[PDB]
Short mmCIF file of C-alpha atoms and ligand atoms in Angstrom, two decimals:
data_model
loop_
_atom_site.label_atom_id
_atom_site.label_comp_id
_atom_site.label_asym_id
_atom_site.label_seq_id
_atom_site.Cartn_x
_atom_site.Cartn_y
_atom_site.Cartn_z
CA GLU A 1 -0.80 -11.68 33.19
CA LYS A 2 0.61 -8.63 33.72
CA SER A 3 3.52 -9.14 31.88
CA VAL A 4 3.29 -6.64 29.09
CA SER A 5 3.92 -2.77 29.07
CA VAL A 6 2.31 -1.08 26.39
CA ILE A 7 3.86 2.37 24.96
CA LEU A 8 0.87 4.06 23.58
CA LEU A 9 2.28 6.49 20.45
CA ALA A 10 0.11 9.60 21.04
CA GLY A 11 2.12 12.59 20.12
CA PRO A 12 -4.21 16.27 15.88
CA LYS A 13 -5.36 13.20 13.72
CA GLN A 14 -5.36 10.59 16.87
CA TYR A 15 -7.62 12.76 18.75
CA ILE A 16 -10.27 13.56 15.81
CA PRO A 17 -13.45 11.69 16.55
CA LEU A 18 -14.69 8.22 15.58
CA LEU A 19 -18.49 7.38 16.98
CA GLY A 20 -17.47 10.24 19.31
CA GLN A 21 -14.43 8.81 21.00
CA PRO A 22 -11.04 10.31 20.18
CA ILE A 23 -9.26 7.75 17.80
CA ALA A 24 -6.59 7.32 20.67
CA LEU A 25 -9.03 5.68 23.23
CA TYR A 26 -10.21 2.73 21.16
CA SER A 27 -6.36 1.01 20.94
CA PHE A 28 -5.74 2.39 24.31
CA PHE A 29 -8.79 0.57 25.97
CA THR A 30 -8.54 -3.08 23.86
CA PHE A 31 -5.42 -2.97 25.53
CA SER A 32 -6.51 -1.94 28.82
CA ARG A 33 -9.03 -5.16 28.80
CA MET A 34 -6.17 -7.87 28.10
CA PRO A 35 -5.28 -9.55 31.50
CA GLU A 36 -1.48 -9.66 29.79
CA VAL A 37 -1.07 -6.09 30.17
CA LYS A 38 0.23 -4.90 33.25
CA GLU A 39 0.30 -0.88 32.26
CA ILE A 40 -0.08 1.33 29.54
CA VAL A 41 2.73 4.23 29.04
CA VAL A 42 0.95 7.17 27.02
CA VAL A 43 3.50 9.40 25.17
CA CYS A 44 2.00 12.50 24.43
CA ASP A 45 1.88 16.24 24.77
CA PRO A 46 0.87 17.14 28.74
CA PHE A 47 -1.96 18.89 26.86
CA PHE A 48 -4.25 15.71 26.13
CA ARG A 49 -3.15 13.66 29.17
CA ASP A 50 -6.68 14.24 30.67
CA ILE A 51 -8.06 12.41 27.41
CA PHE A 52 -6.40 9.07 29.15
CA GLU A 53 -5.97 10.02 33.09
CA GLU A 54 -10.52 10.29 32.72
CA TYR A 55 -10.62 6.37 32.66
CA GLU A 56 -7.82 5.71 35.20
CA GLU A 57 -10.19 4.74 37.99
CA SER A 58 -12.05 2.07 35.76
CA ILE A 59 -9.67 0.40 33.41
CA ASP A 60 -7.63 -2.36 34.91
CA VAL A 61 -3.93 -1.34 34.07
CA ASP A 62 -1.36 1.02 35.81
CA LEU A 63 -1.53 4.00 33.64
CA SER A 64 1.76 6.29 33.59
CA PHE A 65 3.10 9.20 30.99
CA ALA A 66 6.00 10.06 28.95
CA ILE A 67 6.91 12.94 27.04
CA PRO A 68 7.25 13.01 23.57
CA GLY A 69 10.31 13.70 21.58
CA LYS A 70 11.86 14.66 18.02
CA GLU A 71 11.27 11.48 15.79
CA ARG A 72 8.93 8.10 16.57
CA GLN A 73 12.19 6.42 17.75
CA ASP A 74 12.68 9.25 20.57
CA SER A 75 9.23 8.97 21.64
CA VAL A 76 9.44 5.35 22.30
CA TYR A 77 12.61 5.31 24.25
CA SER A 78 11.09 8.25 26.35
CA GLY A 79 7.98 5.58 27.04
CA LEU A 80 10.58 2.96 27.88
CA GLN A 81 12.06 5.23 30.56
CA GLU A 82 8.68 4.73 32.57
CA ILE A 83 7.96 0.89 31.90
CA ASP A 84 8.29 -1.76 34.86
CA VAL A 85 11.47 -2.74 36.23
CA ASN A 86 10.08 -6.19 35.53
CA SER A 87 7.37 -6.35 32.36
CA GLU A 88 8.80 -9.18 30.06
CA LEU A 89 7.53 -7.43 26.95
CA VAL A 90 7.18 -3.66 25.61
CA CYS A 91 4.08 -3.42 23.22
CA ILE A 92 4.81 -0.17 21.22
CA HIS A 93 1.49 1.04 19.42
CA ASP A 94 0.59 3.90 17.22
CA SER A 95 -2.87 5.34 18.51
CA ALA A 96 -3.85 6.02 14.95
CA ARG A 97 -4.55 2.52 14.59
CA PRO A 98 -7.34 2.28 16.38
CA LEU A 99 -9.44 -0.63 15.01
CA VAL A 100 -6.49 -2.89 15.71
CA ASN A 101 -8.77 -6.43 17.23
CA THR A 102 -7.93 -8.00 20.29
CA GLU A 103 -7.32 -11.60 18.72
CA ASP A 104 -4.29 -9.91 16.73
CA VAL A 105 -2.57 -8.25 19.75
CA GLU A 106 -3.01 -11.75 21.38
CA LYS A 107 -0.95 -13.21 18.57
CA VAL A 108 1.63 -10.79 18.05
CA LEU A 109 2.47 -10.89 22.01
CA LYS A 110 2.61 -14.69 21.66
CA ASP A 111 4.90 -14.31 18.95
CA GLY A 112 6.90 -11.68 20.35
CA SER A 113 7.12 -13.51 23.54
CA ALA A 114 8.47 -16.71 21.98
CA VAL A 115 10.78 -14.92 19.21
CA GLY A 116 11.74 -11.73 21.32
CA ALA A 117 10.37 -9.38 18.99
CA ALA A 118 7.45 -9.24 16.39
CA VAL A 119 4.83 -7.35 13.97
CA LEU A 120 1.72 -7.42 13.21
CA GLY A 121 1.88 -7.43 9.43
CA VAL A 122 -0.24 -8.27 6.12
CA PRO A 123 0.67 -9.03 2.94
CA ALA A 124 1.04 -6.25 0.53
CA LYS A 125 -2.03 -5.91 -1.90
CA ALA A 126 -0.24 -3.47 -4.45
CA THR A 127 2.12 -4.62 -6.84
CA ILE A 128 5.39 -3.11 -5.39
CA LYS A 129 8.66 -3.22 -6.76
CA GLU A 130 12.18 -2.57 -5.79
CA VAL A 131 13.49 0.50 -8.24
CA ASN A 132 17.34 1.32 -8.31
CA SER A 133 18.83 4.80 -8.33
CA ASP A 134 18.23 4.76 -12.24
CA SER A 135 14.61 4.46 -11.76
CA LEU A 136 14.89 0.73 -13.07
CA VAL A 137 13.03 -1.92 -12.16
CA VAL A 138 15.59 -4.24 -10.26
CA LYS A 139 14.27 -7.61 -11.47
CA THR A 140 6.88 -11.94 -0.72
CA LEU A 141 6.51 -8.43 0.95
CA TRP A 142 4.22 -7.56 3.69
CA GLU A 143 2.74 -4.38 4.74
CA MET A 144 4.26 -3.89 8.89
CA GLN A 145 1.33 -2.54 10.96
CA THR A 146 1.25 -1.90 15.11
CA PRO A 147 1.97 -3.47 17.84
CA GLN A 148 5.34 -3.90 17.21
CA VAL A 149 6.18 -6.16 20.34
CA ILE A 150 9.87 -6.30 21.76
CA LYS A 151 11.73 -7.78 24.87
CA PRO A 152 12.73 -4.76 27.14
CA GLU A 153 16.60 -6.17 26.77
CA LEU A 154 16.79 -6.27 23.28
CA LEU A 155 15.32 -2.83 22.89
CA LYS A 156 17.85 -1.46 25.68
CA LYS A 157 20.26 -3.21 23.54
CA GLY A 158 19.14 -1.70 20.32
CA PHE A 159 18.99 1.89 21.55
CA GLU A 160 22.50 1.38 23.07
CA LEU A 161 24.06 0.08 19.60
CA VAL A 162 22.51 3.26 17.64
CA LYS A 163 23.77 5.59 19.90
CA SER A 164 27.47 3.91 20.38
CA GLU A 165 28.08 4.06 16.63
CA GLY A 166 25.49 6.95 15.84
CA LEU A 167 23.67 4.77 13.06
CA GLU A 168 20.57 6.08 11.01
CA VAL A 169 17.61 5.20 11.97
CA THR A 170 15.27 5.93 8.75
CA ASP A 171 11.41 4.70 8.86
CA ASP A 172 12.11 1.22 7.22
CA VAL A 173 16.21 1.22 8.59
CA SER A 174 14.26 0.05 12.08
CA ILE A 175 16.67 -0.38 15.21
CA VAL A 176 15.84 -4.16 14.99
CA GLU A 177 17.17 -4.22 11.54
CA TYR A 178 20.75 -3.37 12.96
CA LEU A 179 20.13 -6.00 15.72
CA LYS A 180 21.10 -10.11 14.74
CA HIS A 181 17.76 -11.01 16.92
CA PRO A 182 15.34 -12.08 14.56
CA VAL A 183 11.56 -10.78 14.56
CA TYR A 184 8.46 -12.55 13.61
CA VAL A 185 5.75 -10.88 11.55
CA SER A 186 2.37 -11.82 12.89
CA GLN A 187 -0.27 -12.04 10.39
CA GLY A 188 -2.84 -9.50 11.20
CA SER A 189 -5.84 -8.14 9.94
CA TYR A 190 -6.45 -5.29 6.38
CA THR A 191 -8.98 -3.74 8.83
CA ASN A 192 -6.17 -2.61 11.01
CA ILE A 193 -5.32 0.69 9.10
CA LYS A 194 -3.75 4.10 10.27
CA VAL A 195 -5.60 7.14 10.60
CA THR A 196 -4.59 9.77 8.29
CA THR A 197 -7.71 11.11 6.30
CA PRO A 198 -11.05 11.72 6.45
CA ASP A 199 -11.55 9.06 3.86
CA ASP A 200 -9.70 6.61 5.91
CA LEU A 201 -12.13 7.99 8.82
CA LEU A 202 -15.25 6.84 6.36
CA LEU A 203 -13.22 3.58 6.24
CA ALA A 204 -12.95 3.47 10.16
CA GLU A 205 -16.81 4.01 10.77
CA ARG A 206 -17.71 1.61 7.68
CA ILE A 207 -15.38 -0.99 9.48
CA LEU A 208 -16.74 -0.71 13.21
CA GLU B 1 1.18 11.58 -33.22
CA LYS B 2 -0.95 8.69 -33.96
CA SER B 3 2.22 6.61 -32.89
CA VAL B 4 0.50 4.68 -29.50
CA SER B 5 -2.08 1.58 -29.32
CA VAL B 6 -3.90 1.67 -26.43
CA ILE B 7 -4.93 -1.89 -24.74
CA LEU B 8 -7.66 -0.68 -22.57
CA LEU B 9 -8.58 -3.57 -19.83
CA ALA B 10 -12.18 -3.47 -19.18
CA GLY B 11 -13.41 -7.26 -18.69
CA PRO B 12 -18.60 -4.85 -12.37
CA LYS B 13 -16.49 -2.57 -10.71
CA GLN B 14 -15.25 -0.83 -14.08
CA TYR B 15 -18.86 0.21 -15.33
CA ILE B 16 -20.47 1.59 -11.81
CA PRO B 17 -20.55 5.16 -12.21
CA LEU B 18 -18.63 8.50 -11.27
CA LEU B 19 -20.37 11.29 -11.16
CA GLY B 20 -22.41 9.33 -13.82
CA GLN B 21 -20.08 8.14 -16.16
CA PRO B 22 -18.91 4.41 -16.03
CA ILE B 23 -15.25 4.27 -14.58
CA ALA B 24 -13.93 2.89 -17.67
CA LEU B 25 -14.96 5.56 -19.57
CA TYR B 26 -12.58 8.16 -18.04
CA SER B 27 -9.23 7.04 -19.03
CA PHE B 28 -11.10 5.76 -22.33
CA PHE B 29 -11.72 9.74 -23.22
CA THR B 30 -8.44 10.75 -21.48
CA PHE B 31 -6.52 8.87 -23.96
CA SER B 32 -8.80 9.67 -27.02
CA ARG B 33 -7.67 13.27 -26.41
CA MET B 34 -3.90 12.65 -26.66
CA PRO B 35 -2.56 13.71 -29.91
CA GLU B 36 -0.16 10.66 -29.72
CA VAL B 37 -3.03 8.01 -29.48
CA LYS B 38 -3.69 6.60 -32.89
CA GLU B 39 -6.46 3.90 -31.62
CA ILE B 40 -7.70 2.54 -28.57
CA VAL B 41 -8.52 -1.46 -28.17
CA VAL B 42 -10.70 -2.34 -25.91
CA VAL B 43 -10.79 -5.61 -24.04
CA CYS B 44 -14.18 -6.25 -22.84
CA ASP B 45 -16.89 -8.72 -23.04
CA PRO B 46 -19.04 -8.34 -25.99
CA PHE B 47 -22.03 -6.88 -23.41
CA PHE B 48 -20.62 -3.71 -22.96
CA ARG B 49 -19.48 -2.88 -26.34
CA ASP B 50 -22.26 0.02 -26.79
CA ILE B 51 -20.45 1.59 -23.50
CA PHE B 52 -17.79 2.71 -25.74
CA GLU B 53 -18.96 2.27 -29.32
CA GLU B 54 -21.34 5.04 -28.83
CA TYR B 55 -18.81 7.51 -28.89
CA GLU B 56 -16.92 6.51 -31.64
CA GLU B 57 -17.77 9.25 -33.98
CA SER B 58 -16.63 11.93 -31.85
CA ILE B 59 -13.32 10.88 -30.16
CA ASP B 60 -10.33 11.69 -32.33
CA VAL B 61 -9.01 7.95 -32.03
CA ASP B 62 -9.73 4.55 -34.19
CA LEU B 63 -11.56 2.02 -31.84
CA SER B 64 -10.98 -1.58 -31.74
CA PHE B 65 -12.37 -4.55 -29.77
CA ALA B 66 -11.08 -7.77 -28.31
CA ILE B 67 -12.53 -10.65 -26.39
CA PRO B 68 -10.95 -11.19 -22.85
CA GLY B 69 -9.10 -14.07 -21.62
CA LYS B 70 -8.63 -16.36 -18.37
CA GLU B 71 -6.45 -14.17 -16.82
CA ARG B 72 -4.87 -10.51 -17.22
CA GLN B 73 -1.87 -11.47 -19.53
CA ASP B 74 -4.54 -13.40 -21.90
CA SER B 75 -6.40 -10.22 -22.34
CA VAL B 76 -3.50 -8.29 -22.84
CA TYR B 77 -2.09 -10.71 -25.61
CA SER B 78 -6.09 -10.41 -26.98
CA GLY B 79 -5.83 -6.66 -27.38
CA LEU B 80 -2.20 -6.65 -28.96
CA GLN B 81 -3.74 -9.21 -31.77
CA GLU B 82 -5.70 -6.04 -32.98
CA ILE B 83 -2.88 -3.20 -33.05
CA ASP B 84 -1.99 -1.20 -35.73
CA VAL B 85 0.81 -2.91 -37.56
CA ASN B 86 2.91 0.14 -37.49
CA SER B 87 2.02 1.65 -33.99
CA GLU B 88 5.55 2.22 -31.99
CA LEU B 89 4.47 1.85 -28.28
CA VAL B 90 1.52 -0.40 -26.73
CA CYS B 91 -0.09 1.20 -23.69
CA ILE B 92 -1.93 -0.95 -21.35
CA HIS B 93 -4.22 0.27 -18.97
CA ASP B 94 -6.78 -1.09 -16.46
CA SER B 95 -9.98 0.77 -16.58
CA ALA B 96 -10.18 0.81 -12.94
CA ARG B 97 -7.51 3.31 -13.14
CA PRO B 98 -10.11 6.49 -13.93
CA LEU B 99 -8.29 9.31 -12.88
CA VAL B 100 -4.80 8.74 -14.16
CA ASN B 101 -3.62 12.45 -15.55
CA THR B 102 -2.87 13.46 -19.10
CA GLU B 103 0.79 14.90 -17.78
CA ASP B 104 1.21 11.48 -16.62
CA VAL B 105 0.55 9.49 -19.68
CA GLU B 106 2.51 11.61 -21.43
CA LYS B 107 5.48 10.95 -19.06
CA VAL B 108 5.17 7.27 -19.28
CA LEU B 109 4.77 7.23 -23.02
CA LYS B 110 7.83 9.28 -23.33
CA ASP B 111 9.67 7.24 -21.13
CA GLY B 112 8.69 3.97 -22.66
CA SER B 113 9.40 5.02 -26.06
CA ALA B 114 12.92 6.22 -24.61
CA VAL B 115 13.76 2.92 -22.91
CA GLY B 116 11.57 0.38 -24.68
CA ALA B 117 9.24 -0.55 -21.75
CA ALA B 118 8.22 2.13 -18.69
CA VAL B 119 5.30 1.81 -15.90
CA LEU B 120 3.50 4.79 -13.67
CA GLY B 121 4.85 4.13 -10.13
CA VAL B 122 4.81 6.10 -6.99
CA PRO B 123 6.95 5.81 -3.79
CA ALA B 124 5.26 3.13 -1.70
CA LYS B 125 3.92 5.12 1.66
CA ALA B 126 3.22 2.07 3.75
CA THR B 127 6.45 0.49 5.40
CA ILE B 128 7.21 -2.84 3.83
CA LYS B 129 9.28 -5.67 4.32
CA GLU B 130 10.24 -8.48 2.82
CA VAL B 131 9.35 -11.73 4.96
CA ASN B 132 10.71 -15.34 4.35
CA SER B 133 9.19 -18.98 4.53
CA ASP B 134 9.70 -18.85 8.69
CA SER B 135 7.83 -15.52 8.90
CA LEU B 136 10.93 -13.50 9.78
CA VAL B 137 11.89 -10.04 8.57
CA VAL B 138 14.60 -10.23 5.80
CA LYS B 139 16.77 -7.70 6.98
CA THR B 140 13.62 1.48 -2.13
CA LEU B 141 10.19 0.30 -3.16
CA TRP B 142 7.77 1.82 -5.42
CA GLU B 143 3.63 1.01 -5.46
CA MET B 144 3.31 0.37 -9.69
CA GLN B 145 0.18 1.55 -11.25
CA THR B 146 -0.78 1.62 -15.08
CA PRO B 147 -0.40 2.93 -17.85
CA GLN B 148 2.30 0.00 -18.30
CA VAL B 149 3.86 1.08 -22.01
CA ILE B 150 5.82 -1.21 -24.20
CA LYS B 151 7.40 -1.43 -27.54
CA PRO B 152 5.10 -4.11 -29.54
CA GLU B 153 8.22 -6.12 -30.72
CA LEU B 154 9.24 -6.76 -27.10
CA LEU B 155 6.02 -7.39 -25.94
CA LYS B 156 5.85 -10.03 -28.86
CA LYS B 157 9.13 -11.56 -27.59
CA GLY B 158 7.70 -11.50 -24.34
CA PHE B 159 5.04 -13.58 -25.02
CA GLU B 160 7.00 -16.00 -26.81
CA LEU B 161 9.75 -16.34 -24.02
CA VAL B 162 6.99 -17.63 -22.26
CA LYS B 163 5.22 -20.17 -24.06
CA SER B 164 8.54 -21.40 -25.54
CA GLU B 165 9.47 -22.35 -21.71
CA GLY B 166 6.14 -22.35 -19.87
CA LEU B 167 7.08 -19.74 -17.52
CA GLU B 168 4.81 -18.56 -14.54
CA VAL B 169 3.15 -15.22 -14.42
CA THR B 170 2.69 -14.19 -11.49
CA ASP B 171 1.05 -10.45 -10.86
CA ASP B 172 5.02 -10.02 -9.33
CA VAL B 173 6.51 -12.08 -11.95
CA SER B 174 5.89 -10.49 -15.21
CA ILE B 175 6.73 -11.29 -18.44
CA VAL B 176 8.96 -8.37 -18.39
CA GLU B 177 11.03 -9.52 -15.51
CA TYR B 178 11.84 -12.35 -17.69
CA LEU B 179 13.44 -10.42 -20.45
CA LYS B 180 17.07 -8.62 -19.84
CA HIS B 181 15.58 -5.20 -21.25
CA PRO B 182 15.03 -2.87 -18.65
CA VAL B 183 11.94 -0.82 -17.60
CA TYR B 184 11.71 2.42 -16.55
CA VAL B 185 9.53 3.67 -13.73
CA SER B 186 8.08 7.24 -14.11
CA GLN B 187 7.00 8.62 -11.44
CA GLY B 188 3.48 9.32 -11.08
CA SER B 189 0.69 10.99 -8.64
CA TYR B 190 -0.97 9.36 -5.70
CA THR B 191 -4.30 10.20 -7.22
CA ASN B 192 -4.06 7.39 -9.70
CA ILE B 193 -5.70 4.90 -7.53
CA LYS B 194 -7.40 2.01 -8.17
CA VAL B 195 -11.31 1.64 -7.80
CA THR B 196 -12.70 -1.72 -5.81
CA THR B 197 -14.22 -0.49 -3.18
CA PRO B 198 -17.12 2.11 -1.92
CA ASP B 199 -14.63 3.72 0.04
CA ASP B 200 -12.34 3.97 -3.42
CA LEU B 201 -15.37 5.87 -5.19
CA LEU B 202 -15.45 8.24 -2.21
CA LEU B 203 -11.90 9.19 -2.68
CA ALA B 204 -12.72 9.30 -6.62
CA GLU B 205 -15.19 11.82 -6.29
CA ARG B 206 -13.68 13.84 -3.63
CA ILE B 207 -10.34 14.16 -6.06
CA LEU B 208 -12.66 14.83 -8.86
O1 2JM C 301 9.99 -2.01 14.12
C1 2JM C 301 9.70 -3.03 15.19
C2 2JM C 301 9.55 -4.41 14.90
BR1 2JM C 301 9.20 -4.31 12.96
C3 2JM C 301 9.63 -5.36 15.57
C4 2JM C 301 10.01 -5.05 16.96
C5 2JM C 301 10.01 -3.52 17.42
C6 2JM C 301 10.18 -2.56 16.42
C7 2JM C 301 10.06 -1.14 16.88
N1 2JM C 301 9.22 -0.40 16.46
C8 2JM C 301 9.96 0.81 16.70
BR2 2JM C 301 8.96 3.00 16.26
C9 2JM C 301 11.43 0.41 17.51
BR3 2JM C 301 12.09 1.91 18.06
C10 2JM C 301 10.96 -0.72 17.65
BR4 2JM C 301 13.11 -1.77 17.86
O1 2JM C 302 4.19 -4.73 -16.37
C1 2JM C 302 4.55 -4.40 -17.13
C2 2JM C 302 5.74 -3.25 -16.98
BR1 2JM C 302 6.06 -2.85 -15.31
C3 2JM C 302 5.98 -2.40 -18.08
C4 2JM C 302 5.61 -2.46 -19.69
C5 2JM C 302 4.85 -3.55 -19.63
C6 2JM C 302 4.35 -4.20 -18.47
C7 2JM C 302 3.49 -5.52 -18.81
N1 2JM C 302 2.04 -5.52 -18.03
C8 2JM C 302 1.14 -6.58 -18.29
BR2 2JM C 302 -0.35 -7.00 -17.46
C9 2JM C 302 2.03 -7.05 -19.36
BR3 2JM C 302 1.04 -8.71 -20.26
C10 2JM C 302 3.09 -6.47 -19.40
BR4 2JM C 302 4.75 -7.46 -20.50
CL1 CL C 303 7.65 3.47 12.37
CL1 CL C 304 -0.78 -6.58 -12.96
K1 K C 305 -5.19 -5.50 31.89
K1 K C 306 -6.61 0.47 13.28
K1 K C 307 -6.53 4.44 18.79
K1 K C 308 -5.96 -6.66 13.58
K1 K C 309 7.04 -20.89 20.22
K1 K C 310 -4.85 6.64 4.27
K1 K C 311 -5.71 10.99 -30.20
K1 K C 312 -6.88 6.36 -11.29
K1 K C 313 -11.17 4.47 -16.38
K1 K C 314 -1.57 10.28 -12.39
K1 K C 315 15.73 10.14 -23.64
K1 K C 316 -8.66 0.02 -2.92
#
């Protein structure tokens, strides 16, 4: 209870409405109702701060703010600097995923608490193959969603490793791929889509 | 010119209409206009034969029919038994992909002709990871579409290998993954989606 800090990445496609609520608020509220969650650090341009501070008084979590950075890992680092000195888990979430279920968030929190690092994923429905640099097929795969859940010590150690050795963070060379510490994949729901198109937004409403 | 036989897998989500033409006819017509294409072998339940034989007289290819099998590889084998004794390439296509562009089909035909086996693919937009049997992340990926283009000798040799050794054909352990012969991945278009949902069908119309 009150052990988890959420870093909510909200820095424009995550403020466009879905039944008249900006997409970013769906997951915001889902996290605010979970007794495990102590605080939510929203990482957004100071413009849209009010979109969230409006509800500060009704929600049952502390709210905090951080400024976005250049790339997604900068924004996480920025959020991390504002979490509570004693939180046991950091829960990083892309606000463009509105439909994450409370039950799936409980699952990945539990797994992150057990393993140290966990991510919600689903089996990749497409036929996916590795291709080499000559465009030839190189003779089980999962799609990663968010939350991505990590103990704060591990995250901080991960940022230090990258800075200390000027490592390259690609989308698929994560910070955690550099650590030897294991990352668990918690099985989520195919309904936890990311919103980036109007046809995504039709799906969103079809699902709600 | 007239060197390619198409095996069109059409064996119900590929007959539902898209601007009032059953989905299966879009690619059927795309192939029928290409001078390279000699014949199209439609693999469908004898029910819907008429959906295609109606146009037999206007299209500029020979039309042939084969009966579906248990699994997708059975239906390809069934189609293969009806191709022309002298075709140089077999072009296998899922009729649930209506929007394949003529230019992308020309590309994968050329690559299959050069390499012996080619498939239209696109870089996988999701973050995809390998996961082991303990659900831990195992520390370039492409989504395969169709056509899948293969010289007929190679396909036949591939079917013989599987039967000869009772190998297991999963969706992702293809017949071609058993061969030592290389498979080229021709870069396609993200618009070459597969139709399986109404939201897919909204995308289809949004794209046309
Ligand atoms: O990708 C992760 C997985 Br998979 C599991 C736990 C944490 C992460 C993660 N996500 C981001 Br954005 C950062 Br920076 C980090 Br570390
Ligand atoms: O997957 C393929 C690639 Br990738 C490239 C060429 C041919 C194939 C293929 N597709 C199917 Br269905 C069969 Br049976 C075969 Br062999
Ligand atoms: Cl990411
Ligand atoms: Cl397949
Ligand atoms: K709470
Ligand atoms: K979602
Ligand atoms: K959201
Ligand atoms: K979910
Ligand atoms: K445990
Ligand atoms: K999308
Ligand atoms: K033709
Ligand atoms: K298509
Ligand atoms: K079609
Ligand atoms: K295409
Ligand atoms: K060549
Ligand atoms: K789909």
